[PDB]
Fold HDHD2.
Amino acid sequence: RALKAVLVDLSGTLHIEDAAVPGAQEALKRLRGASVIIRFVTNTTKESKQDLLERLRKLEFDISEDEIFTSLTAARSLLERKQVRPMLLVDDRALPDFKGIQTSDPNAVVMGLAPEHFHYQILNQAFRLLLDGAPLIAIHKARYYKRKDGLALGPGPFVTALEYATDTKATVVGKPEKTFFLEALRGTGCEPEEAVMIGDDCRDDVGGAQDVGMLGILVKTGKYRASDEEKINPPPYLTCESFPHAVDHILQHLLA
Ligand SMILES: [Cl-]
Ligand code: NA
């Protein structure tokens, strides 16, 4: 084998957050010199690709839109391939990522985190579409997330609500699903066994990736807490102190 692609988590790994991880920018420059394929990945249901992109550029990361693959991109890919018309239960700010997807006579349900749509009447309409055989596509299933005033419900509980109602599993597109990481390499010409994933979240980043054949590097910044390394078996391929260190390891060890 040989290493041809690198998947880099964004939040926790490159920036943490609205401030860059120290060395991150120069480390990414080192990476681009290595002549390796690079894809920046993340779970989001509310930030468009341009939104993330604008933020990364303000932190002086030089990145293309073609290199960013998020759970929204993944949700959009699935829609094009299945040729379906979604009922879009998503934040308005995610809509630019479904530009061009037809919504008339919906025959699919896409769920992200969308408080304005998460109420009885609209959930029951989604339910009634599911009964009719429409698939349920979950951008991801996080239970909760941390906002200014405490933890708040993520999309995961609402998705789980509809699975329970219909007694069926959603198709989950984001991390840690296997299909996420495989979709991330579509168009790269690269197989997962020729790829490494770098992130701060052991289950969602390393666990998920290692499960498709990728090498997983846990970095100890951002969301990482002490001993997170042993929350998976097998353990991570490598546990580094930060993205820069991960990059240094890739250059001196894996790149042939
Ligand atoms: Cl391909
Ligand atoms: Na992360």
The chain has two domains: 1-84+174-256, 85-173. Residues 9, 11-13, 199-201, 223 surround sodium ion (ligand 2) (CB under 6 Å).
